[PDB]
Design a protein around this ligand. Structure first.
Ligand SMILES: O=C(O)c1ccc2nc(-c3ccc(Cl)cc3)n([C@H](C(=O)NC3CCCCC3)C3CCCCC3)c2c1
Ligand SMILES: O=C(O)c1ccc2nc(-c3ccc(Cl)cc3)n([C@H](C(=O)NC3CCCCC3)C3CCCCC3)c2c1
Lengths: 227, 10
């Protein structure tokens, strides 16, 4: 039971979310590249760089984002980059792959210059995400909400927390239609947003590690991740 | 900076 201004909004969010492709040239490296900390770090860079290019495209095709302040427009984007990437990584990671393709993935994630003290909470988050059995619509909406977060140095807030509002209201209605058995679903979804936010500290810690140990990032990533 | 504003505008 969605309203018409809700189905249109949803259809909009879904239209931009389904544009997010990942060139076969980059992904094919997972199945063809050599197993070494460098080649795996190389994959992460190319992927996370394409992700930012596509996330900006998803962000501006958002309803009302373009009707915002050029410093609030870029405030939000700069701020959601890390969260949105790990959320996308959790979504992909949680897809049913064929025989030992998930083991291959997990092996690469490990040998990519990240110390396990972060890897452990990473997989901890992925399983928790996997447990919620999230639909396509919930990932897209969750992504829109993580971007439209009037929190952490945009000046306005009220306007930011006006576009995000019907989004959450749509995310709620969705939780009842598809998971009416579990009425804690909505609370649990927002719950993963909290665990998601904690990734900025861990990400900063891993950044310096690759940094001090001679691992280079693309100029776009240097702007987004602050290097 | 340069790249982000660029991607946003064009
Ligand atoms: O488009 C995206 O948004 C996307 C983003 C990141 C991805 N990481 C992998 C990956 C993860 C682990 C392994 Cl082991 C290999 C790739 N895939 C898979 C893929 O595209 N494989 C190709 C399929 C087409 C030929 C080239 C490889 C898909 C593929 C469909 C199921 C979900 C994951 C990705 C797809
Ligand atoms: O392809 C997958 O199915 C996949 C699944 C889960 C992942 N978790 C991480 C991850 C680990 C550490 C950090 Cl810091 C960030 C993410 N990555 C990385 C990535 O490039 N993600 C894309 C980012 C952009 C959106 C699509 C997934 C790298 C990790 C190293 C080997 C190659 C995969 C993942 C890739």
């Amino acid at each position: 039971e969605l309203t018409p201004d809700q189905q249109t909004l949803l259809h909009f969010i879904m239209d931009s979310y389904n544009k997010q492709r990942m060139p076969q040239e980059i992904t094919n490296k997972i199945l063809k590249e050599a197993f070494s900390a460098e080649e795996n770090f190389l994959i992460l860079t190319e992927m996370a760089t394409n992700h930012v290019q596509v996330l900006v495209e998803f962000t501006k095709k958002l309803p009302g984002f373009q009707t915002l302040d050029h410093e609030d427009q870029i405030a939000l984007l700069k701020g959601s980059a890390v969260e949105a990437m790990f959320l996308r990584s959790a979504e992909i990671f949680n897809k049913k792959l064929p025989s030992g393709h998930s083991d291959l993935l997990e092996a690469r994630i490990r040998n990519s210059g990240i110390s396990d003290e972060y890897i452990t909470p990473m997989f901890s988050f992925y399983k928790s995400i996997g447990e919620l059995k999230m639909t396509q619509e919930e990932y897209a909406l969750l992504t829109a909400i993580v971007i439209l977060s009037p929190d952490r140095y945009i000046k306005d807030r009220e306007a930011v927390e006006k576009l995000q509002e019907p989004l959450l209201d749509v995310l709620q209605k969705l939780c009842k239609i598809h998971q009416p058995e579990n009425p804690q679903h909505f609370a649990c979804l927002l719950g993963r947003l909290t665990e998601l936010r904690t990734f900025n500290h861990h990400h900063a810690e891993m950044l310096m590690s690759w940094r001090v140990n001679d691992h280079k990032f693309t100029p776009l990533l240097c702007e987004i991740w602050d290097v | 900076h340069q790249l982000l504003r660029y991607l946003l505008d064009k």
